[PDB]
């Protein structure tokens, strides 16, 4: 343990950095690195990795999903909330972000929050299915007037 | 008389809804609404 574990981390950690520096992008390297630090519960490091990966390629939707997911897995609700907001702000067209964002809020219990999100979403005049999901959302509660509106 | 947030003369510490009485140093950056409308999520 105390030192023996440590050396292991240097070899992995250093290797991860080498891979990234060599290829720069190829975000499977970024992601694997993030995952490893997440597994060791060094999530502050993980956050920085994800942010660095975003600097390289902010459009990559798998990256963002892995980032938000990581926060949620560690019960870091408010971090996740921030991240979701960013994702939808910079890549509004990606419907996956919206669906997950509303789902998370619903799970947390924040119906008002979810409603707010959906109202933002609808401003983009999206797709038939999105509207259906908003209506269905309302219909999981009575809220028939809202649905009709 | 109330002794709860629900309910100057009182001469009591009363905090009526949610003004914090103990240090938190909370991260959150104040949510804002502008004039009539919107939570300024931007």
């Amino acid at each position: 343990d105390e030192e023996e574990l440590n050396d292991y981390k240097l070899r992995k950690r250093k290797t991860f950095e080498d891979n990234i520096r060599k290829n720069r992008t190829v975000i499977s390297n970024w992601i694997k690195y993030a995952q490893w630090e997440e597994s060791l519960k060094e999530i502050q490091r993980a956050r920085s990795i994800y942010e660095r990966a975003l600097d390289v390629d902010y459009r990559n939707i798998t990256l963002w999903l892995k980032y938000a997911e990581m926060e949620m897995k560690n019960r870091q609700v408010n971090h996740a909330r921030n991240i979701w907001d960013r994702a939808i702000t910079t890549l509004p067209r990606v419907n996956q972000f919206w669906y997950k964002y509303t789902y998370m809020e619903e799970m947390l219990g924040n119906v008002a929050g979810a409603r707010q999100v959906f109202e933002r979403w609808m401003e983009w005049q999206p797709e038939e299915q999105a509207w259906h999901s908003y209506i269905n959302f309302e219909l999981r509660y009575k809220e028939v007037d809202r649905a009709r509106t | 008389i109330p002794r709860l947030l629900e309910d100057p003369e009182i001469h009591v510490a009363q905090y009526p809804l949610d003004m914090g009485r103990k240090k938190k140093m909370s991260n959150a950056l104040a949510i804002q609404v502008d004039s009539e409308g919107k939570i300024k999520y931007d």
Partner: peptide, 29 residues
């Protein structure tokens, strides 16, 4: 040499957003 194993190479503390990250800390291995 110590830009790795001593001190976090380059650090970006995450930006802080409408929620409380003060409380959160994480477990050892």
């Amino acid at each position: 040499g110590v830009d790795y194993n001593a001190e976090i190479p380059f650090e970006k503390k995450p930006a802080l957003g409408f929620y409380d990250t003060s409380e959160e800390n994480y477990q050892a291995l």
